Task: inverse folding
């Protein structure tokens, strides 16, 4: 049997005998040298800041010298060359929610188990009985299901960023932004799988919503934007900023909040909103981090504010057009709704909510002159 | 009341449709250079979804942090550990931390490389796991700093690590090797070799030695880390499976594997043997025995053997690796100790029992290393008033210490009982020093991949105390060095003790 | 002087502070890369400080470029006014026409020295890294251990000091 | 300072020396003598069964003799005299969800923390914007608000049972049934408190909903039934059975699921359903335990089945009348809804769902002859 | 995106309106007989709601169960405990378990008594807390059974406790005393006296004795239980506050308090000191000092003093409790040991070091108890082949053992170093035996509240082994007794060993 030094009389006595009288240094605070963002250093910061071994030549790095092994050709492991944005210190970023691995999986796990109990309750409660069949069969199955691919693409857009992020704080935020997206895609399928269990004849195969995504008209420009953001952008910041501060903030928010969350309730559907609640909770959580990185740290950088804002305004313009195109094609879905579901007045107000929120939360932060009426009118152009 | 059986949906039921999530478009391809084609349709072993992944990890965290925060703290477990082990854990936890960290980026790269949704999903879970591991290793140092006998180093390794030479080599195997190169070469360095050959057995061995040395903090955390490793092995296996049916595999796989194998063993062979044998009071097993089982038998034989059906074969450099192994860790500790002022940890000369243990397990140890250590002690290497640093002995005895341009591993050819090979080239106005035929070929074939400045090039003409000072190698009193040549509670060396020695670095290649 | 701050780094931020046009900044950055980066650098005199100095030069070029260029040009033109896509394509085409690994490394390494951001936009540059690196490796990694070291030392052209 | 026997060399040496060679008994299973309900003994059962120190004179007790101290007059601490129901063994009950304290609070905590995040997300997302002001200010505030008193009364009905329950397994289930009820009452107030924070002028004071409960017409018979179930019933089993298998199964399920959960979505309200989801999940969890105790254990008792069913049918008839009166008065709320909100056909369908569900899940288990049409017609008399 | 700051609502914001949840109706009154009136505007100290309560406790649970399942199990903490303490915990955890259990019902009764929603809410938190505590004490026995040195008894105390006389007294103070009577008298037994005077300080003391004896399991659990106790003392304090401004208080409060104080101390004074001093190897503090500090100082002085403004006075029976206290625990252990075959745990005679410790702290201990223990050992009380059980010595030396009709505490007036009082009455054909003036008044004034049959009455005319067999007092082999007169691993007593003694119970009162 194994003898442990903490409990074995012989070994412990030897250990105790070697110990000093008191600690050899009174400074018992790990990352004590890290500049805290708040009043006192947090656990999130201590466990995260400076984990990335950058040298001083990547803004804010504490190490020195070149990397030990680079790519064939000479490209650095991490380098300034992977993004247009510049800063005085890449370690400035702080997720306002202070999420390191432990609290992140803790919360997601709570949502998972509660999701399981909710479904167990919903099915036992027979709440499906009053859900409109047309909404369920056409709208949730095909159209909401098609949206899974949008979120999946947005998830995949983060792959390069996971590899190229220039700091630990940014990498952690980025990974969580991406992981929440795949989760949402999976929750859309989970709902379809649930319907297949409680509704005879309902087919959980992704065939239908996939065909809608790849070949339909309503999500045509959406898919084109996603394919672009994911595979045509090689700058990790352009990807993150454009996905979260342009495309998803406008198109995603409209689709999730202004179409499905707003309309599913009119069809006796409290099922889809249960999952959209998670999606919106996740959107608002990421937003805080997106704003901190792009506005507080980059857009407001003491030495590169002007430069960065120029680049971000550039990306906003670049991605605003395909985003509008995405919303415009999506307007086509309203024509497919049963008569009397909505009207142009409600659609218009919903469009303004999304645009106004985007202007206050994102556009205005970098002095991007967005014309609300101009944007709403362009989208309304696609109603039928 | 109501009607219908309570029903729900699990991970497998959703994962069943995950492969179908990816769709075709012209530019749906990896953003990274690669000689290989990862087959779409490649499947993954673990049928996970994000929510279930979080749940499975959360339960583990619950147990771990519960133990740490309650019982272990009540037991003062952060204190009742052998002084030597408290020091070893500064290096073990922080160096492993960087591998966990770079592994996040590596798997992000692999997620990008994979075209099949399931394969991307497999790499994704590892992305999240490596973040978990980064925070776990960080927590081990956080805990020891908060509750241990010597927080210095544990509390600032992220910046104090930069003063010393051993850190450069760690960056080669667990940072750059994981992310810089063909995605497949990185996967071989990370998963197929790094994790399967070294990390997986090392993590558990570390809990063994820790426990032997009174440390119950490390086993609590490291045993939790090891529960995730199975999925990472699967990712590595899947990498090979994904590229195996393409013509490029026959042409390139085995050389990328051989290069990755050499890369990983070049550092771990001497370093881990050093950390175990010289960083502990109580020993678990001689490293010569351990290395043979881990690398030659377990990995080199069985593990790799399971990949034979995909065209993988034993690294052609395996024989060379075994030959160079035996004395590697002994040769290295001489240098690590000689350069003690550059560390962020405290080191000790082997005591009488250890010298006996070493000789019993490595005949001839005493005649070479033992006598040297005794001479250094006589010269006063432990005493602040001696004015002696072992590096002085190297100079007096014409024993230059070089840094391998490729692996960054320090070596002293004229002294070593191991390899003794040295290759020095001049190219375009710069000289380069190599310690073996494999790394030499790497540089000759890919000089632009290996331009890392060494400690002697950067510190050239600088006086030692000024380097330590600028790089914050001091304890909170702002005068006592973090590093020490002994692990006792007093007679600690100070910056001024170092300054009086007037040790000024020289680039050894300039002798040529 | 120190590791993170010293006389040479000081001398360089002073010289960088004097650049006042995108063209002079971009030229100095390109010349710097030919003179101090890669195994082909003209000199090893700045070995300990070039990485950091280069970054400072890049900042100046970036800032001036964002002010000078209209939005489309910031996305599609190099700091010197060349069409990025044309340079990308022509460089990759030369790489794909390379007859051996020796010609190949020169094309990739040289491309980096001349176009590394902020000269060429990052989107085009990293797409180049993707394409160029692939061919460089395919050529280098074929029969990787066939040439004996004695001959490989001569192919590389090192002066063996031993 | 404090030397601990597990780590102190000298003390551990002494302990180690006194230790036996191997354990003195190989039966290392606590609760090994308890008859497992399932395949193998569960942790839930081991930690719970026989914790109550009953003597053999209370069916299933393992102890002997009288209590050591009784009430003035001689009433026993616990006794057969506190309920009409009889059984072969009061320890037979098992909560199918197997909840002891740890899993119960774990699940509720997840719900609390996710509720907090949901609210943070909802407020940040501006989702109230599309909520109908009348439904918000009148229906949620006053009418749903008033229902909090119904759930609070139901929670209070459990006090005597917490004191009088004749077994550990029944006591733990009973407490959890009651604790969920008070939780729901608090969630109704929580919503009103949230609305007060995000809606200018909304008053979270309970004065309005309380006056609706204590003086309005809609909840009159509901309040009367609650007051009786809580304070006029001195039999702990009559209370739990009549609350869960009669009143709340009919009236509560109608109000929560058929009125608010069904109609709130039609007024752009996904906020109330978020909480009702919790109430319905809780109701369905409690149902399984209520069914196990009253039907599997008592109603199907090998010795007292017929007796217990006679008593439970007696209680059903006793409480069905005031429950129907509760539903009848509640029908008056339909006339207060905006024109076109719902109709007699939907209302009738919803009533039949509740009644049929009740007959299947409760009434039929004891052979109580319920006439679905008679009940629905009796309720519809308060509509038109 | 957003338009409005993220907002939520906390427990206190909801609690602000909780008092208004209760409404007026004719029959809104308590279902329990009581002399008092709890004011309907009574407030509670902790502003909690069900959700927040659950979260608070869930955090505690994860810490605790993490320690138990991870580090403590890895440390084999269930085993490395002194044999005597392993046995003591069978009693300490199971007996405390019934206290937690009945406390659930007690607080249910109190929740029914309270008319103010807030007061009801406070009692409700306790209902749930006591459920938590029941499962916690259960878990301690479950953990020692699963992983410890002697599972018997830990594994079935819920049925094996019924064999012995100490269990009867435990049910009086921690079962019936908590739930049978005026709700206020029950609150005084539970909260004002039980928890405030005994349990709260006891739980902590248990962790100190457990730690001294190598037990790290109990500290982990009992320290967690302790975190909930302040809420309960607030409940007790609130009970007094709620009834103090009504005429009934001046007439009845101090009497119910005095009765509750005597009730609790009568059992705990001898039992706790016995479990601590005789149930341990390593000693933390002599019981005489502890008792004086807990009961006289902390409780009777400070704690009680805080209630003076509500008309509460120190119990009139305090001086009597101190008088009878000194030797109480010593006197009782003689009886518990003499009756060892009736327990569900193993007892040991004091060793030589303990004997010295006992005499040092209790002058006169040796010539009375020391001599008896030495005589019993000489007679072979530890040896299964002796044919001797100490009960026989009592019979031979004419020292009848009686059971107090009220408290159930066993007493031997003719041998006792402490109290020698003995009052025997015949009433309507039955005799009753009392050990003190306070309990005698309780019976005379309330005979129908005290009819508990004692072990000599139930077992009258029965041979010992038949009683042990019927009540399952055996180990899994179906032969060896659970109870033992020594804590060694060999020469364990058997059912046949007891049968051979032919010990037949006699009701001591039949001698009058
Ligand atoms: Fe890892
Ligand atoms: Fe790993
Ligand atoms: Fe308790
Ligand atoms: Fe308590």
Result:
């Amino acid at each position: 049997e194994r003898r442990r030094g903490l409990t074995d009389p012989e070994m412990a006595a030897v250990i105790l005998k070697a110990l000093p009288e008191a600690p050899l240094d009174g400074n018992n605070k790990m990352g004590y040298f890290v500049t805290p963002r708040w009043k006192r250093l947090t656990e999130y910061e201590a466990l995260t800041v400076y984990a990335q071994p950058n040298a001083d030549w990547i803004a804010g790095g504490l190490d020195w010298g070149d990397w030990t092994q680079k790519f064939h050709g000479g490209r650095p492991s991490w380098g300034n060359e992977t993004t247009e944005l510049r800063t005085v210190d890449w370690f400035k970023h702080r997720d306002p929610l202070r999420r390191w691995h432990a609290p992140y999986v803790k919360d997601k796990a709570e949502e998972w188990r509660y999701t399981d109990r909710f479904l167990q309750g919903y099915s036992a409660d027979g709440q499906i009985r009053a859900m409109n069949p047309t909404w369920r069969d056409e709208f949730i199955n095909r159209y909401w299901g098609a949206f899974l691919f949008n979120e999946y693409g947005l998830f995949n857009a983060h792959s390069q960023g996971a590899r190229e992020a220039l700091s630990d704080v940014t990498r952690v935020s980025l990974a969580f932004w991406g992981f929440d997206k795949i989760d949402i895609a999976q929750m859309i399928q989970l709902e379809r799988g649930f319907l297949a269990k409680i509704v005879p004849g309902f087919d959980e195969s992704t065939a239908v919503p996939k065909a809608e995504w790849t070949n339909g008209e309503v999500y045509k420009s959406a898919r084109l934007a996603v394919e672009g953001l994911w595979q045509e952008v090689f700058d990790w910041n352009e990807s993150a900023f454009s996905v979260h501060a342009v495309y998803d903030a406008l198109f995603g928010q409209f689709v999730r909040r202004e179409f499905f969350q707003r309309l599913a309730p009119r069809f006796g559907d409290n099922l889809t909103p249960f999952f959209i609640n998670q999606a919106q909770t996740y959107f608002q959580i990421a937003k805080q981090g997106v704003q901190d990185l792009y506005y507080n740290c980059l857009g407001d950088d003491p030495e590169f504010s002007d430069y960065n804002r120029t680049v971000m305004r550039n990306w906003t313009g670049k991605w605003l057009e395909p985003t509008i195109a995405a919303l415009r094609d999506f307007m086509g879905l309203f024509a497919k709704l049963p008569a009397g579901t909505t009207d142009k007045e409600e659609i218009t107000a919903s469009l303004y909510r999304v645009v106004d929120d985007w202007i206050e939360d994102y556009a205005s932060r970098i002095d991007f002159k967005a014309d609300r009426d101009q944007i709403v009118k362009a989208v309304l152009a696609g109603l039928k | 009341a109501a009607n219908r059986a309570p029903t729900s949906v699990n991970a497998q039921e959703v994962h069943r449709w995950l492969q179908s999530f990816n769709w075709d478009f012209k530019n749906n391809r990896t953003k990274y250079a690669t000689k290989y084609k990862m087959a779409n349709e490649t499947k993954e072993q673990f049928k996970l979804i994000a929510k279930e992944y979080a749940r499975m990890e959360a339960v583990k965290d619950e147990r771990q942090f519960g133990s740490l925060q309650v019982a272990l703290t009540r037991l003062n477990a952060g204190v009742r550990v052998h002084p030597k082990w408290n020091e070893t854990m500064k290096v073990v936890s922080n160096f492993l931390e960087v591998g966990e960290y770079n592994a996040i980026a590596a798997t992000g790269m692999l997620w990008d490389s994979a075209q099949a949704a399931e394969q991307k999903n497999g790499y994704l879970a590892q992305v999240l796991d490596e973040i978990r591991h980064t925070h776990q290793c960080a927590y081990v140092n956080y805990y020891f700093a908060k509750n241990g006998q010597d927080p210095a180093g544990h509390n600032d390794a992220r910046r104090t690590r930069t003063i010393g030479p051993l850190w450069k080599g760690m960056k080669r195997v667990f940072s750059d090797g994981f992310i810089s190169g063909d995605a497949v070469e990185c996967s071989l360095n990370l998963q197929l070799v790094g994790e399967a050959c070294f990390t997986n057995p090392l993590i558990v061995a570390v809990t063994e030695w820790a426990a032997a040395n009174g440390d119950e903090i490390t086993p609590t955390v490291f045993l939790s880390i090891e529960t995730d490793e199975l999925r990472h092995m699967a990712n590595g296996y899947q990498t090979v499976v994904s590229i195996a049916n393409d013509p490029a595999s026959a042409k390139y796989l085995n050389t990328d594997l051989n290069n990755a194998f050499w890369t990983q063993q070049k550092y771990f062979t001497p370093v881990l043997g050093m950390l175990f044998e010289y960083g502990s009071k109580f020993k678990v097993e001689p490293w010569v025995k351990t290395w043979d089982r881990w690398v030659y038998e377990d990995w080199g034989g069985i593990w790799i053997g399971r990949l034979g059906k995909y065209g993988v074969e034993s690294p052609r450099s395996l024989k060379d690796a075994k030959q160079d192994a035996y004395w590697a860790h002994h040769d290295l500790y001489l240098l690590a100790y000689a350069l003690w002022p550059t560390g962020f940890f405290r080191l000790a000369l082997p005591d009488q029992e250890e010298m006996e243990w070493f000789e019993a397990n490595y005949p001839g140890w005493y005649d070479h290393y033992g006598k040297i250590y005794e001479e250094w002690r006589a010269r006063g290497c432990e005493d602040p008033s001696s004015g002696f640093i072992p590096l002085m002995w190297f100079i007096e005895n014409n024993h230059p210490i070089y840094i391998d341009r490729v692996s960054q591993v320090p070596f002293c050819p004229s002294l070593a009982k191991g390899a003794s090979t040295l290759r020095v080239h001049e190219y375009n106005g710069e000289m380069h020093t190599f310690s073996d035929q494999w790394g030499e070929r790497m540089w000759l074939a890919e000089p632009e991949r290996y331009e890392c400045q060494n400690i002697f090039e950067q510190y050239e003409g600088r006086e030692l105390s000024e380097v330590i000072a600028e790089l914050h190698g001091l304890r909170s009193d702002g005068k006592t060095l973090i590093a020490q040549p002994h692990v006792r509670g007093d007679k600690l060396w100070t910056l001024d003790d170092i300054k009086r020695l007037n040790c000024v670095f020289k680039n050894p290649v300039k002798a040529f | 002087l120190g590791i993170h701050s010293n006389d040479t780094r000081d001398a360089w931020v002073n010289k960088i502070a004097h650049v006042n046009t995108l063209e002079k900044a971009a030229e100095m950055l390109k010349q710097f890369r030919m003179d101090h980066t890669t195994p082909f650098r003209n000199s090893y005199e700045l070995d300990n400080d070039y990485l950091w100095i280069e970054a400072k030069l890049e900042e100046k070029v970036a800032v001036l470029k964002a002010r000078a260029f209209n939005e489309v040009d910031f996305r599609h033109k190099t700091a010197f006014g060349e069409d990025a896509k044309s340079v990308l394509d022509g460089t990759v085409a030369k790489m794909n026409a390379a007859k051996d690994k020796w010609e190949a490394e020169k094309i990739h390494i040289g491309f980096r020295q001349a176009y590394k951001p902020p000269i060429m936009p990052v989107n085009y540059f990293l797409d180049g890294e993707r394409q160029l690196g692939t061919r460089l490796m395919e050529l280098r990694n074929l029969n990787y251990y066939d040439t004996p070291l004695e001959e490989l030392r001569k192919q590389r052209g090192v002066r063996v000091v031993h």
Q: What stands out?
A: The first helix of chain B runs from residue 11 to 15. The domain at 1-512 of chain B is CATH 1.10.620.20 (Ribonucleotide Reductase, subunit A). The first strand of chain B starts at residue 402 and ends at 403.
